[PDB]
Every structure is written in C-alpha cells, then in structure tokens.
C-alpha cells in the first residue's frame, strides 16, 4: 500500500521568463500587456470626437472655404486632425501663438460659432467684399468665413472703432488679421493711408499693429502677408477694435466651454458607430490590463504605455507532463 | 527549484490530478487514484490572486496624454518635452519588465515550497509506519484502506492504531 505527494500538470504551452531562467513552460499564467486595438475611431464615454476633415486647427478656426462647414454648435471628447491636412492657412503669413492656442483648445469641450460683428451692419463707409485667389473655393477667389477683408470705399478709409461686449457667460475666442501689402501703392489703393494702424484692446489684452511694407518672395502666388492674432475675451468683458487700415476684421467668433480629458490627435482611422473608454490614433482599446504596447498617445482611461513585447505573469506551476 | 521538490526529488507533474495544484495519489486493495489537497491549493490561490491584484493595483489609470507642438524657434522646449516623455517611458518599461521577472521567480519558488511543505507534513504524520521509497512516495508497513488514506489526506492519521502491525512488518 502506497501514498504519493505530487503536483498539477497540464497540457499548457504558456511560457514566462524569470531571472535565473528564460522561457519556462508553466501550467497557468496571466498576460498583463494589452496589444490589440479595433482599428477604429470611436465615441469616448458616449461623446463623439471633433473631426476637422480636410482642415487642421488653423483652417477650421480661420474659416477656410475649402473645408465643409460644421454645425453652429459642437461638443466633443477629443479633436482629430488628419495627417495630410491640405487646407490650413490659405493666405500666407504668421499665426501668432498658434501652438498656445492649440493647447487652449485641448481643454475645450464645446463651441458655439456666432456672428460677433455682422457683415453689412458693422463697418459702415468701408468695403467688405475683398477676396483672394490664395483662398479659392470652387475655382473662384474667396476668403475666410470667419474674417472680413475691410478695404477703402469711394476713395476713402475712415477710422473705424467697433466693440463687442461678452454676454455669452463663457470665454469668447476672437480672431483677427493684419494685412501687409508688398508696396505702398497697394497700401494706398486698399487703405488710402500710408501711416495706418490697428488697435485691439480688452481688460487684459492690449496690442497695436503697424503695416510693414516690403517686397517678399511669392507664397501661394502672394507677395503680401497676413498675420493672424487671437484672444480669449472673458465673460462680461469688452473687446474694442480701432483702425484706419489693414485690419482683417472678425465676423464670427467662438463661445467656448471647458472640459477635462480631451486632447488633439492626428489619425488615419475612420469614425464608426462604437463606444470606448480608451482611444489611440491607431484605434480604440477595450481592456482592463495594466499595460499596453499599442501607442504612447492615449485619450481616456487607458493602460500605461510600455515598449515591452511581452509581460506575462506566471500563476501556476512549472509544467512537467513527463 | 529553491526547495528541491518540483523538478527535484519529485521529478514530474500529474496530468491525472485535474482538481488542484498540489495533491495525492494512492494505491491500496480497494483501488488507486488522485485527490488534490484543497487546504494548500486554496492557500496558494489566495496568495497568487493577491499578488496579481497588487501588480495591477500599483499601476494607476493612465489618463489623457497627447503630444504638443512647437514652432521653429522653440527647439529647446521641444527637445525637453521629448526628453521627459522618453525618460518616463524608459523608467516604466524597466519597472514593468523587472517586476514581472522578479515576481515570476518568487512564484515558482512559492509553489516549490508548498509541495515540499506538504510532503514533510505527510512524512511527519506517518513516521516509521511507512518508508520513503523516493519520488515523493510512501510505502506503508500496514494495510491502509480508503479511510486510512483519507485520514492521512485530511491530517488526522492515527499512528498508534497501526504502530504494532507496522512494527511487525518492519521487523
């Protein structure tokens, strides 16, 4: 009569590494590293992302004509740019503190596009029909949907001074532009004053802009330049524009709402009818595992990114079916 | 292993023991068979469950983390942001891989120890009423029916009850 003591064994082919030995076949084990995604852009906690289509942030914010127009009000969980964004700034020039603006938009969860300065109504004694071929649409020369190219009317550019009081109860993103002709002849033909200036003030913002005329290499067949500026007008505060030339005036502005967990990602994937808690530029992750090796860029509640190819924890025994 | 049982003086595992990690095999007149030890298996499961769960718990939820952009005159800040991201990534990859290796080693050792401890528990219960025939087995110096076997398995083996007969067979 005999009794023996022994241990479990099974057919498993799971292998784990240890310090003293690599590649040990074990009976049981747990994988801690997520490596699978669904290859789709999804809703994040039930909220769809903001897709900019053919535009980047600049093209969308300035109102590039080539980009399909979005609904007046939007709410999102994250912003998606496409890698090949052909439509951005269409009239050559610098967009000041653009990166800072993107970083601001990274915590915005909603916008309302509203007419801050109505077209035919706000700039009397000035022309508002200025267009350009650098910003073409359907072949014809056009211009930014959110801005207005003010020029001389009937041989004169009278000093304008207009203002907006923010009664939206939220921050209002106001954008404008400053035009820089390549010569003084064009400066006179457009704004009738060689010593022009633009002034923009709020309670906490205070800037003055002066035309700087010089011949420049052609960009998008333009020797002139256009510098783009922006400011966030606090609730209740007032913004004042004052100019006698060169002002690319605001026409539409954005009432903004703040949120958490958002961000801007560059992605190729397509939006699908699906929901997730974790979104990467390559696809959505549905996992409760502590690590992932899919992508460093994550939106939502995601596992920690690591470079590892394998993170497998043994729980069972050294497997010896022999 | 560290305690010398698994892949040691007990060469291999039992595909035939399907209801636990550690267990017994017996052979007597009534027949033979496998029966796992639940007290030890359930202790090991509790332990390793708590180990896995802590490895998961120590890693917090990774909330939103996306890239930033910098203009052509902010190369230093761009490289510093990159330096930060790469540093943190190195450190976490290192930490994860190392923790998994260490804990794997300790887990195999833990199992080895459980098997050895079970063996020793049985040995100390049986004393000289049986002999160690190697490979983790005991040969009784007396008849051990199903009831006797079960008394051994649930830790209530009655040594004096079989001491005489065993002494006689051992001679």
């Amino acid at each position: 009569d005999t009794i023996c003591i022994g241990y479990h064994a099974n057919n498993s082919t799971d292998t784990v590494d240890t310090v003293l030995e690599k590649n040990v076949t074990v009976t049981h084990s747990v994988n801690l590293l997520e490596d699978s995604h669904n290859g789709k852009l999804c809703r994040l906690k039930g909220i769809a992302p903001l897709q900019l289509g053919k535009c980047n942030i600049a093209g969308w914010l300035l109102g590039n004509p080539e980009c399909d127009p979005l609904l007046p009000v939007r709410s999102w969980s994250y912003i998606v740019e496409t890698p090949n964004s052909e439509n951005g700034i269409c009239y050559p020039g610098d967009f000041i503190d653009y990166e800072e603006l993107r970083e601001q938009l990274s915590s915005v969860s909603s916008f309302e596009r509203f007419e801050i300065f109505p077209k035919e109504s706000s700039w009397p004694n000035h022309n508002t029909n200025g267009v350009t071929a650098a910003c073409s649409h359907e072949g014809k020369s056009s211009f930014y949907r959110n801005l207005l190219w003010l020029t001389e009317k009937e041989g004169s550019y009278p000093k304008l001074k207009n203002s907006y009081v923010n009664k939206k109860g939220k921050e209002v993103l106001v954008l404008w532009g400053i035009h820089h002709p390549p010569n003084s002849k064009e400066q006179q033909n457009l704004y009738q004053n060689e010593n022009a200036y633009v002034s923009v003030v709020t309670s906490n913002y205070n800037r003055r802009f002066t035309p700087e005329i010089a011949e420049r290499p052609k960009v998008r067949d333009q020797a002139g330049r256009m510098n783009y500026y922006w400011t966030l007008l606090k609730p209740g505060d007032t913004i004042i524009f004052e100019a006698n030339g060169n002002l690319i005036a605001p026409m539409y502005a954005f009432a903004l709402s703040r949120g958490f967990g958002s961000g801007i990602i560059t992605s190729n994937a397509s939006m699908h009818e699906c929901n997730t808690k974790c979104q990467t530029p390559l696809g959505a992750i549905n996992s409760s595992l502590p690590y992932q090796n899919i992508h460093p860029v994550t939106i939502g509640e995601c596992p920690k990114y690591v470079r590892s190819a394998k993170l497998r924890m043994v729980t069972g025994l050294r497997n010896i079916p022999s | 292993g560290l305690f010398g049982a698994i892949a040691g003086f007990i060469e291999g595992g039992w595909t035939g023991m399907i209801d636990g990690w550690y267990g017994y095999h017996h052979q007597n007149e009534q027949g033979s068979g496998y029966a796992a030890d639940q007290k030890s298996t359930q202790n090991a499961i509790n332990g390793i469950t708590n180990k896995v769960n802590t490895v998961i718990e120590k890693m917090n939820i990774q909330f939103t983390a996306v890239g930033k952009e910098f203009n052509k005159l902010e190369k230093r800040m761009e490289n510093l942001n990159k330096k930060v991201d790469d540093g943190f990534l190195d450190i976490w990859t290192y930490n994860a891989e190392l923790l998994v290796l260490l804990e794997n080693e300790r887990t195999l050792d833990f199992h080895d120890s459980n098997v050895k401890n079970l063996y020793e528990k049985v040995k100390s219960q049986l004393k000289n009423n049986a002999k160690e025939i190697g490979n983790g087995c005991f040969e009784f110096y007396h008849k051990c029916d199903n009831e006797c076997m079960e008394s051994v398995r649930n830790g209530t083996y009655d040594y004096p009850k079989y001491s005489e007969e065993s002494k006689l067979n051992r001679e």
Binding site: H28, V30 | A36, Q38, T41, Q42, I45, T49, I56
Partner: peptide, 11 residues
C-alpha cells in the same frame, strides 16, 4: 481579478 482555475475554490 479572480483565479478560477479549479471549481471548488471560494473567490
């Protein structure tokens, strides 16, 4: 997590 490796375990 729960390790349901055997069917008589308690959790």
């Amino acid at each position: 997590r729960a390790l349901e490796y055997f069917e008589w375990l308690s959790x």
